[PDB]
Coordinates of C-alpha atoms in Angstrom, one line a residue:
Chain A
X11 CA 38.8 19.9 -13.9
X12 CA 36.3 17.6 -11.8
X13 CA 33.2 16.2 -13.3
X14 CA 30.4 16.9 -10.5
X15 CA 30.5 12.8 -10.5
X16 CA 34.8 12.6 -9.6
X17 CA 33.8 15.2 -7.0
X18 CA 31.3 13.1 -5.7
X19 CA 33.8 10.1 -5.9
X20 CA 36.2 12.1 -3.7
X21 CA 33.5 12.9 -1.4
X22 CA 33.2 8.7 -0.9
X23 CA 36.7 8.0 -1.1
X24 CA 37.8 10.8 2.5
X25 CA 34.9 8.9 3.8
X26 CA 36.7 5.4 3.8
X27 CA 39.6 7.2 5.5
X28 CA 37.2 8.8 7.7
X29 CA 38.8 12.4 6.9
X30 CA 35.9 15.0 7.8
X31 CA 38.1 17.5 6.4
X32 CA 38.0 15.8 3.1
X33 CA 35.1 14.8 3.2
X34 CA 33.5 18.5 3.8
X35 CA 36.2 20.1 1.0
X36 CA 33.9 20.6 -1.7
X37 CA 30.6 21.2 0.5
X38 CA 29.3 24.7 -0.7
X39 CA 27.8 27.5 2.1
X40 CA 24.5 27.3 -0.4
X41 CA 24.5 23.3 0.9
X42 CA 21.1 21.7 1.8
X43 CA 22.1 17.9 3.1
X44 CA 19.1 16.0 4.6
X45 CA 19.3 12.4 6.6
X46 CA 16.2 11.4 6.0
X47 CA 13.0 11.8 8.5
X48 CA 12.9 8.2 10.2
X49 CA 17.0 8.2 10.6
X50 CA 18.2 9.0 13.8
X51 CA 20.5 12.2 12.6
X52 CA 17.1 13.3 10.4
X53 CA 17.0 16.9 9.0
X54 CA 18.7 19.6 6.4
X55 CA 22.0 20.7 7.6
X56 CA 23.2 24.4 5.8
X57 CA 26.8 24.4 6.6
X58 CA 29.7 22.1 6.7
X59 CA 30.3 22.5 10.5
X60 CA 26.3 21.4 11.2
X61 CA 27.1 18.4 9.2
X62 CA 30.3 17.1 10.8
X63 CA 28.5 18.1 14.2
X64 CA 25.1 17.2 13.7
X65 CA 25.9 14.2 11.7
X66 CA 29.4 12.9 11.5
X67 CA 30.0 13.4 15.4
X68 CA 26.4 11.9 16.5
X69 CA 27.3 9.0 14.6
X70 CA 30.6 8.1 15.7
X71 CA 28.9 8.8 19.6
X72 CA 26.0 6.9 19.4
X73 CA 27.7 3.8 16.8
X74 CA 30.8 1.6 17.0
X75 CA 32.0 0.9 13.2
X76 CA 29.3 3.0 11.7
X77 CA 30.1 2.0 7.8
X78 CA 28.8 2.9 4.8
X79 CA 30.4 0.8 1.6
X80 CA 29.4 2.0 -2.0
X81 CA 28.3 -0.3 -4.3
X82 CA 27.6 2.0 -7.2
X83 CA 27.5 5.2 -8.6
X84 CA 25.1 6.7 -11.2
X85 CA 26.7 9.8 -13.4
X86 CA 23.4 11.8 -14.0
X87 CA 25.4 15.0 -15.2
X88 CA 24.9 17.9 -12.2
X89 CA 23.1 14.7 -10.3
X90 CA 24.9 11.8 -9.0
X91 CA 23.7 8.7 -7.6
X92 CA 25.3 7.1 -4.8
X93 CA 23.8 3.0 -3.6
X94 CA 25.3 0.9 -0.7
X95 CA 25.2 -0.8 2.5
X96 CA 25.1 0.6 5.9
X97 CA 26.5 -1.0 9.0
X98 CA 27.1 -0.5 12.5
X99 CA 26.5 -1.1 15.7
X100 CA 24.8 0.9 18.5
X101 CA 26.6 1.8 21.6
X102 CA 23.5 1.8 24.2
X103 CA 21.9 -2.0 23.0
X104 CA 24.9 -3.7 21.2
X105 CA 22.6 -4.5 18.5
X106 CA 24.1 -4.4 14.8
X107 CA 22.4 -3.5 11.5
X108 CA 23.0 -3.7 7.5
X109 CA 21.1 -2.5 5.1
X110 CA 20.9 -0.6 2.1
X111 CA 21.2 3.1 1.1
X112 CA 20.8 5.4 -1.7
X113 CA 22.3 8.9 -1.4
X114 CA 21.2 11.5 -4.2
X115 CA 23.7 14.7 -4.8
X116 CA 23.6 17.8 -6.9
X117 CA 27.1 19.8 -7.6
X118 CA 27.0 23.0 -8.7
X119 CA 30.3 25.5 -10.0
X120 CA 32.1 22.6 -8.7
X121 CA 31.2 22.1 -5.0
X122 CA 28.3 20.2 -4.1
X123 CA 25.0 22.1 -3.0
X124 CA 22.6 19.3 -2.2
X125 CA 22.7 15.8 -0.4
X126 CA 19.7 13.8 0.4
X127 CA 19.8 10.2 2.2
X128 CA 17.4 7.7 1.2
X129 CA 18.0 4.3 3.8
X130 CA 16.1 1.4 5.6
X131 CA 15.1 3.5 8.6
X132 CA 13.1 0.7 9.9
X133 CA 16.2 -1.7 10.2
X134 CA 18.5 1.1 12.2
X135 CA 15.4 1.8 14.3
X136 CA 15.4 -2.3 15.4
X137 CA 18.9 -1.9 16.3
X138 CA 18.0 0.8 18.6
X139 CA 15.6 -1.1 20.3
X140 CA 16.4 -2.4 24.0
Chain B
X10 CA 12.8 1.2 -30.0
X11 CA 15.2 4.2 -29.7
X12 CA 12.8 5.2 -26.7
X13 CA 15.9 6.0 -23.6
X14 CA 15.7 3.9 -20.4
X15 CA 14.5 7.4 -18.8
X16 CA 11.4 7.5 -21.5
X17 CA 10.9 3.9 -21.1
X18 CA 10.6 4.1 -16.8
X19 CA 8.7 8.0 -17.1
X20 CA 5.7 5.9 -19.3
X21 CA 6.3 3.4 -16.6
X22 CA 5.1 5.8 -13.9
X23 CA 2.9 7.5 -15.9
X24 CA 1.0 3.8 -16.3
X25 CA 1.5 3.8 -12.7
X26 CA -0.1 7.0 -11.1
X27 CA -3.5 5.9 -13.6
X28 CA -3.3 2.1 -12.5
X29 CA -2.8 0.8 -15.8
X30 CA -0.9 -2.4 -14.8
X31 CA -1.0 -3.7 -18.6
X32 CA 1.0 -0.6 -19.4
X33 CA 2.9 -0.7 -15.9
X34 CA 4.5 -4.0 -16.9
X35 CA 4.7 -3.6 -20.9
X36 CA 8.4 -2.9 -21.0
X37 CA 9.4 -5.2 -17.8
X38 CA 12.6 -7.9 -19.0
X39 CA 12.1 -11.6 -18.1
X40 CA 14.9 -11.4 -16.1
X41 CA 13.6 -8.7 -14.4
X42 CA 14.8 -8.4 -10.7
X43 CA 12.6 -6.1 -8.7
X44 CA 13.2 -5.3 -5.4
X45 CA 11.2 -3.9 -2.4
X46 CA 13.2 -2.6 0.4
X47 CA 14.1 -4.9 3.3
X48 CA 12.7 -3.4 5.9
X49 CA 9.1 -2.0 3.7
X50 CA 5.8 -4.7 4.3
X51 CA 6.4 -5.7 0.5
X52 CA 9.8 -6.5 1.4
X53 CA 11.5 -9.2 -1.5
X54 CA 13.2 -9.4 -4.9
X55 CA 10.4 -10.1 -7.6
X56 CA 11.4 -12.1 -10.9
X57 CA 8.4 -12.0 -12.8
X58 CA 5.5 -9.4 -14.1
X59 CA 3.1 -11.4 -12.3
X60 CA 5.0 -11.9 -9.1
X61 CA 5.4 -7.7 -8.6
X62 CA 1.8 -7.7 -9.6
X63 CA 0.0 -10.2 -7.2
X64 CA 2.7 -9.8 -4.4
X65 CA 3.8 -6.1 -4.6
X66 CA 1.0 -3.8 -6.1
X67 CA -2.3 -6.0 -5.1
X68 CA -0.8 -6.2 -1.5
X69 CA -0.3 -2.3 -1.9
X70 CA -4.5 -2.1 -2.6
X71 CA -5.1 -4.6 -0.7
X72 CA -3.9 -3.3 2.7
X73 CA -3.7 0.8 2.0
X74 CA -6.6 3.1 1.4
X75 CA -5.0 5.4 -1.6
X76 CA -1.8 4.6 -1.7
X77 CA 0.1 7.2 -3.9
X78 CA 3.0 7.8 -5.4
X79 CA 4.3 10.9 -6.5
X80 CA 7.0 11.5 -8.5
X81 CA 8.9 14.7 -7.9
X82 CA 12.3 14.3 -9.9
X83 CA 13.7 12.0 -12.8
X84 CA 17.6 12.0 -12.9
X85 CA 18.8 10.3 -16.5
X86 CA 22.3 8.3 -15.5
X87 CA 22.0 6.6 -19.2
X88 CA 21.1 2.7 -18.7
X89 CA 20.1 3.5 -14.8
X90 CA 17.6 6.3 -14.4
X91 CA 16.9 7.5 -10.6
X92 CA 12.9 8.4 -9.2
X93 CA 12.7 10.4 -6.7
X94 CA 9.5 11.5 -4.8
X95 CA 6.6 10.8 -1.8
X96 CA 4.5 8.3 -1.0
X97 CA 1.3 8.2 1.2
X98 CA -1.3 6.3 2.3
X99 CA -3.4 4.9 5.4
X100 CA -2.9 1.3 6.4
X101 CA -6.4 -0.3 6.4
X102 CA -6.0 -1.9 9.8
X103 CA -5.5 1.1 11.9
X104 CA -6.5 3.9 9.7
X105 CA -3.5 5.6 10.3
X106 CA -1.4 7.6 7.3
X107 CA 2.1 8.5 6.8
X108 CA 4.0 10.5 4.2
X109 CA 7.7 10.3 3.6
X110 CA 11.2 10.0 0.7
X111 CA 11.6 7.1 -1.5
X112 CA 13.9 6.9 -4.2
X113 CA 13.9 3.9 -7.1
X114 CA 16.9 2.7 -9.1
X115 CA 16.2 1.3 -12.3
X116 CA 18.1 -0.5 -14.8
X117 CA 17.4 -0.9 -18.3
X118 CA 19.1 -3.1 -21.4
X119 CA 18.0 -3.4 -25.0
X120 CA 15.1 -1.6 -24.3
X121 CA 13.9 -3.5 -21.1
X122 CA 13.3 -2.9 -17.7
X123 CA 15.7 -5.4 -16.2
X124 CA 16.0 -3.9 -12.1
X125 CA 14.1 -1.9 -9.8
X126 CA 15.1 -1.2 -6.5
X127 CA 13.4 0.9 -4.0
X128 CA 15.1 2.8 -0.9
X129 CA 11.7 4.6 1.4
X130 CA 11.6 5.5 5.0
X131 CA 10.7 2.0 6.3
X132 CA 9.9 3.5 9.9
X133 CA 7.5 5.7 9.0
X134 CA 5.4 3.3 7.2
X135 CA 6.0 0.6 9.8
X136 CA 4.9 3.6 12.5
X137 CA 1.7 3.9 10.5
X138 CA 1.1 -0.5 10.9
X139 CA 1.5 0.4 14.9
X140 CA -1.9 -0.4 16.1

């Protein structure tokens, strides 16, 4: 059986083949998943669908190549730790961005019950700019 | 000595929140590499006690009336150890405040604080600098 950190792995790994399914497998109806206040898709999503909608599809709308690449991941038991870099580049301006992002996750029975987004909302926000 | 990383970064903040900056910096590593967000006005990677000191927290008092941080969750990953909370404050210059997130990743070895990192919402503290 998965350790809440593999099914956070898994969560990463359907994300670099872009598979929303995937990505959304283990994603319990309890789920609070929050992109942070100063990001563009800010606020707590409670379902799977409201995530791929409100998130996932608002992303690849608004960004070309929207990336995230994880450079580590922290096993704190029912916590896991997730750090990387952002890219992307946004449809309206042209203007690219990188920077770095932490994501925090709880799992708990085995699906995952809390996300939270911690990024460099300032440097999105200047790619945004006209 | 067998204090864990997560002991040795909770006395950290502790020192912290009562600005004891001897205690603060007591268990920092010489090769500390301590890092301030990109986009946040501190913005850098720091590689001594006294560099974080002068340019990171002075700068903090310096330019903000009451600059906080509080600490809402610890999460123990072994060597790294994860803070997560709010900060606040009201830049000086415009008297304007904000609240948001931040999380800091430390890293610790043999007992040492060896890497901070810190991820905030950069916009809202830069919207708060907006004259």
């Amino acid at each position: 059986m998965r350790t809440p950190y593999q099914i956070v792995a898994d969560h990463y790994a359907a994300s670099d083949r872009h598979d929303p399914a995937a990505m959304m497998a283990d994603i319990a109806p309890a789920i609070e998943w929050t992109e942070m206040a100063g990001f563009p898709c800010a606020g707590t999503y409670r379902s799977a669908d409201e995530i791929v909608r409100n998130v996932f599809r608002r992303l690849g709308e608004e960004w070309d190549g929207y990336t995230f690449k994880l450079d580590a991941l922290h096993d704190a038991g029912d916590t896991v730790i997730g750090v990387g870099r952002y890219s992307g580049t946004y449809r309206r301006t042209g203007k690219s961005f990188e920077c770095r992002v932490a994501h925090v996750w709880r799992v708990d029975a085995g699906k995952i019950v809390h996300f939270e987004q911690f990024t460099d909302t300032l440097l999105v926000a200047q790619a945004m700019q006209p």
